[PDB]
Design a protein around this nucleic acid. Structure first.
Ligand SMILES: [Mg+2]
Ligand SMILES: [Mg+2]
Ligand SMILES: [Mg+2]
Ligand SMILES: [Mg+2]
Ligand SMILES: [Mg+2]
Ligand SMILES: [Mg+2]
Ligand SMILES: [Mg+2]
Ligand SMILES: [Mg+2]
Ligand SMILES: [Mg+2]
Ligand SMILES: [Mg+2]
Ligand SMILES: [Mg+2]
Ligand SMILES: [Mg+2]
Ligand SMILES: [Mg+2]
Ligand SMILES: [Mg+2]
Ligand SMILES: [Mg+2]
Ligand SMILES: [Mg+2]
Ligand SMILES: [Mg+2]
Ligand SMILES: [Mg+2]
Ligand SMILES: [Mg+2]
Ligand SMILES: [Mg+2]
Ligand SMILES: [Mg+2]
Ligand SMILES: [Mg+2]
Ligand SMILES: [Mg+2]
Ligand SMILES: [Mg+2]
Ligand SMILES: [Mg+2]
Ligand SMILES: [Mg+2]
Ligand SMILES: [Mg+2]
Ligand SMILES: [Mg+2]
Ligand SMILES: [Mg+2]
Ligand SMILES: [Mg+2]
Ligand SMILES: [Mg+2]
Ligand SMILES: [Mg+2]
Ligand SMILES: [Mg+2]
Ligand SMILES: [Mg+2]
Ligand SMILES: [Mg+2]
Ligand SMILES: [Mg+2]
Ligand SMILES: [Mg+2]
Ligand SMILES: [Mg+2]
Lengths: 101, 116, 87, 70
RNA sequence: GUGGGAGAGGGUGGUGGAAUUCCCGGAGUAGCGGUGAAAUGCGCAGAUACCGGGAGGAACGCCGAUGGCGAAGGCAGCCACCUGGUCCACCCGUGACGCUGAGGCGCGAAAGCGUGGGGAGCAAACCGGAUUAGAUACCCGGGUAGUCCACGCCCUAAACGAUGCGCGCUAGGUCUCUGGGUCUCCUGGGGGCCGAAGCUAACGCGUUAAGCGCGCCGCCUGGGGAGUACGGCCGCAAGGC
């Protein structure tokens, strides 16, 4: 198992009934693929640099997990299924390379 | 018949012609002119004189609909691309800002033999 | 790929003695595993040619060490091949 | 002119999510600045380029912008 | 072996924005386009220019380099999986296991061929407009094969460093990529430039040798005829050795 980072951006127009559903759906998808969640950072409303899905903003999520490597692309396929889900970028974790140290 | 009094002005300047359109803040055009709309027919259209008169014809046409404030957009390189701007500031239309939005691809389409 | 967990498992099995990492038997065992990792990678991905070149160099090196073991001590050569199912 | 690394703190070159610092390395347009203007090294610029492209896909950094001048 | 390192190395899937074309709508009149000037062309069935929405294919701006990787061909968005090569530090293990390499086998830009797709832009042939003494051309408007994908052929090249491979040896200076180090620098492995000795017909090469040596393969023996004829092998053909 290697350690990855999941970036999820979805429609920033949801109420709490739809927001809890979409995120608890993301929980259910990670459970089925065996993602041990190490930590979570939720930024939420953020000004985008260009219109995405005609919408000038986005609601941001970030998960750091440890999972089997062979199942990563199928996990990415499962997250983009939801209409409210717009951006899914999975990057393998790396060391914080410093500059001007 | 519209009374917009403010809007955008696009300058499409090529090496063979310079053409000016004037629109409302939403992008929908009001009036327009070009090097061919005025008397010039051939290669005289891509000249700075033609670019000047074309800018001033559309400016006076926009006076009819009551334009005062103008935001300027510029696309393309060509003779009279600067002469059209200079003619627009002194046209009576108070120029609000000037932006260069010339489209540059990310190397996606093969150009004609002329451009390679 | 090939993790150090699987790596040490092989070296300790084919070592002539504890602490031996470079015996001819050890290198051939190690070479043979990477052969089988690549030969299954090339069943699929038949159009991966630049990886196919690396496999030819591994076979050449494996057949080089085996041709050597043959000359010096032919018994350990038979015990090795029978244990790896080659030739 | 000053250079970007010269006027900056100790920052993570691999973090694609820090827009406040990555905005410094973009020009007036969305373009990536050359090494002469960023003051970075060879290995540093190659890492910055890939992390800027990452932020661009997350909608955080712009691909291109509009020049207000001329 | 162990532990680290860089990278458009390769294959598979996925994915992002800019731009071109086309469609839908809004708005909006009289031309756009193109050239040394022009005309064919397109436009009142409403184009060009502007805003919005949509579809499709191909290529990846800045970063970008005189850079990096690969045996060569060659490889530039981003993400993930599979995966090859190579380099450095430790001085641990095996104990000459090495070098080259006629055949053989595999790879091999583009173009071309077969089957089925795909088809935005570009564009042989071709259709036109000009130029011209003439235009079977350079310039302009259109446009099919093709370029793209899958699978199988084709095996050519200024396939170039016009320099086969491996090793040892022979002043340095300077720029650089990437490692390690007691980190003005020292020390490796690549990529450039000046230049000692020496070589070379000269231009020039010069620790990345075209120097001094050694090992092995390939190849040369005046030009035209001619990479032609014949024969053979290969190929569906074009045609190749
Ligand atoms: Mg979706
Ligand atoms: Mg003209
Ligand atoms: Mg690659
Ligand atoms: Mg690839
Ligand atoms: Mg329409
Ligand atoms: Mg007509
Ligand atoms: Mg008509
Ligand atoms: Mg008609
Ligand atoms: Mg179509
Ligand atoms: Mg460049
Ligand atoms: Mg190299
Ligand atoms: Mg690797
Ligand atoms: Mg020793
Ligand atoms: Mg001993
Ligand atoms: Mg060899
Ligand atoms: Mg051979
Ligand atoms: Mg070929
Ligand atoms: Mg081809
Ligand atoms: Mg074909
Ligand atoms: Mg064309
Ligand atoms: Mg043509
Ligand atoms: Mg003549
Ligand atoms: Mg004629
Ligand atoms: Mg067509
Ligand atoms: Mg020689
Ligand atoms: Mg250092
Ligand atoms: Mg060197
Ligand atoms: Mg001399
Ligand atoms: Mg020299
Ligand atoms: Mg030498
Ligand atoms: Mg000579
Ligand atoms: Mg010959
Ligand atoms: Mg003769
Ligand atoms: Mg021939
Ligand atoms: Mg004969
Ligand atoms: Mg014959
Ligand atoms: Mg035959
Ligand atoms: Mg021929």
């Amino acid at each position: 198992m290697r350690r990855y980072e999941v970036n999820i951006v979805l429609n920033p127009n949801l109420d709490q009934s739809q927001l809890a559903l979409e995120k608890e759906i993301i929980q259910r998808a990670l459970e089925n693929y065996g993602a041990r969640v190490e930590k979570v950072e939720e930024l939420g409303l953020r000004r985008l640099a260009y219109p995405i899905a005609k919408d000038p903003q986005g609601y941001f999520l970030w998960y750091q997990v440890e999972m089997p490597e062979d199942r990563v692309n199928d996990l990415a396929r499962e997250l983009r299924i939801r209409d409210n889900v717009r951006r899914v970028m999975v990057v393998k974790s790396q060391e914080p390379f410093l500059a001007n140290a | 018949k519209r009374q917009v009094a403010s809007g955008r002005a696009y300058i499409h300047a090529s090496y063979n012609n310079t053409i000016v359109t004037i629109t409302d803040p939403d992008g929908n055009p009001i009036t327009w002119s070009s090097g061919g709309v005025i008397g010039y027919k051939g290669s005289r259209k891509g000249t700075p004189y033609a670019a000047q008169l074309a800018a001033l014809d559309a400016a006076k046409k926009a006076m009819a609909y009551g334009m005062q404030s103008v935001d300027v957009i510029v696309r393309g390189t060509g003779a009279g691309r600067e002469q059209a701007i200079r003619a627009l500031q002194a046209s009576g239309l108070q120029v609000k800002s000037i932006v260069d939005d010339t489209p540059v691809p990310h190397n996606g389409c093969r150009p004609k033999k002329k451009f390679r | 790929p090939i993790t150090k967990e699987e790596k040490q498992k092989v070296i300790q099995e084919f070592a002539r003695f504890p602490g031996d990492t470079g015996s001819t038997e050890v290198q051939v065992a190690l070479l043979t595993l990477r052969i089988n990792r690549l030969s299954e990678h090339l069943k699929v991905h038949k159009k991966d040619h630049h990886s196919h070149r690396g496999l030819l160099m591994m076979v050449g090196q494996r057949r080089r060490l085996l041709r050597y073991l043959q000359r010096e001590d032919p018994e350990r050569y038979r015990a090795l091949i029978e244990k790896l199912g080659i030739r | 002119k000053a250079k970007v690394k010269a006027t900056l703190g100790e920052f993570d070159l691999r973090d694609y999510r820090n827009v406040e610092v990555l905005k410094r390395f973009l020009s007036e347009t969305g373009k990536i600045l050359p090494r002469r203007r960023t003051g970075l090294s060879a290995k540093e610029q190659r890492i910055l380029a890939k992390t800027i492209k990452r932020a661009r896909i997350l909608g955080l950094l712009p691909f291109t912008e509009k020049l207000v001048r001329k």
